[PDB]
Ligand SMILES: [Ca+2]
């Protein structure tokens with residue numbers, strides 16, 4: 001998928017997590033976010049379409065999605081332990097990272 | 107160890123998992139798989155030897171190994187929770203991903 | 213931060229972990245290590261300033277931080293489960309890897 005569509009997926013699953021009722025729902029949403037973030041790693045965002053795929057700017061873009069993947073895992077590890085409210089709180093940090101990525105690269 | 111030797115290591119530990127009984131065996135084979143996948147991520151596979159190191163194809167190859175690493179992680183998580191049968195089923199699907207990447211880039 | 217400052221951050225937190233009393237301290241130090249490893253993926257060791265950003269040597273450099281990040285993941289999952297002595301044992305393995313990567317690229 002396109003970068004913008006992956007970003008839509010990330011925001012939508014953040015909403016799902018915010019209203020989630022159990023650990024399975026959180027796990028499922030975070031899995032979909034992980035797939036969207038790994039897919040966005042292969043994309044080029046609008047701001048960087050005038051940069052080469054291995055420019056320092058594009059390497060930093062990909063590393064920013066690595067950062068997001070490890071934050072997704074923090075929430076996911078909490079959810080795997082059945083600690084649903086803790087995982088939702090952790091998803092708050094994901095909102096910050098996603099919004100900052102949106103604003104930096106759109 | 108080059109890329110093809112790492113793919114062989116991955117397949118060997120997949121067999122080890124499929125015949126394992128206790129969770130420490132599965133976990134040990136999965137940890138060896140993680141190391142092999144990380145070593146393969148920094149290789150150039152035979153199909154892409156004529157491509158620029160800065161090519162989109164090489165970036166896609168490396169992100170594909172990140173995808174494999176998170177699938178390995180999911181299996182490893184199931185094995186850490188003592189869910190031997192579930193981890194072995196997860197590794198059965200890993201056979202597909204690993205051998206798909208193998209045939210794709212050999 | 214540049215590469216050597218990030219490696220210093222890794223080493224500082226490995227010492228904090230060695231001399232830690234509870235799991236919260238281990239978790240805090242490990243989260244800092246993760247942030248430094250990720251940030252170092254965007255850095256360039258002085259002796260590689262001339263190579264391409266996607267040169268095989270720079271790929272090697274970045275994937276070496278992925279290797280560290282998965283070791284940190286193991287230690288941090290152990291610390292989140294209260295397995296403090298086990299987390300510290302894993303961090304002692306981390307020390308070896310950090311020093312090897314330092315020797316490789318400095
Ligand atoms: Ca759209």
Ligand SMILES: [Ca+2]
Nearest residue numbers: 048049050051
């Ligand atoms: Ca372009």
Ligand SMILES: [Ca+2]
Nearest residue numbers: 272273276313
């Ligand atoms: Ca290295």
Ligand SMILES: [Cl-]
Nearest residue numbers: 005008009012
């Ligand atoms: Cl939409």
Ligand SMILES: [Cl-]
Nearest residue numbers: 058059062063
């Ligand atoms: Cl990268």
Ligand SMILES: [Cl-]
Nearest residue numbers: 062165168169
């Ligand atoms: Cl990459």
Ligand SMILES: [Cl-]
Nearest residue numbers: 259260261262
């Ligand atoms: Cl140089």
Ligand SMILES: [Cl-]
Nearest residue numbers: 054059165266
């Ligand atoms: Cl790259």
Ligand SMILES: [Cl-]
Nearest residue numbers: 168271274275
């Ligand atoms: Cl890379």
Ligand SMILES: [Co+2]
Nearest residue numbers: 059062168274
């Ligand atoms: Co890269």
Ligand SMILES: [Co+2]
Nearest residue numbers: 073077179289
């Ligand atoms: Co995990």
Ligand code: NA
Nearest residue numbers: 259261262263
């Ligand atoms: Na030089």
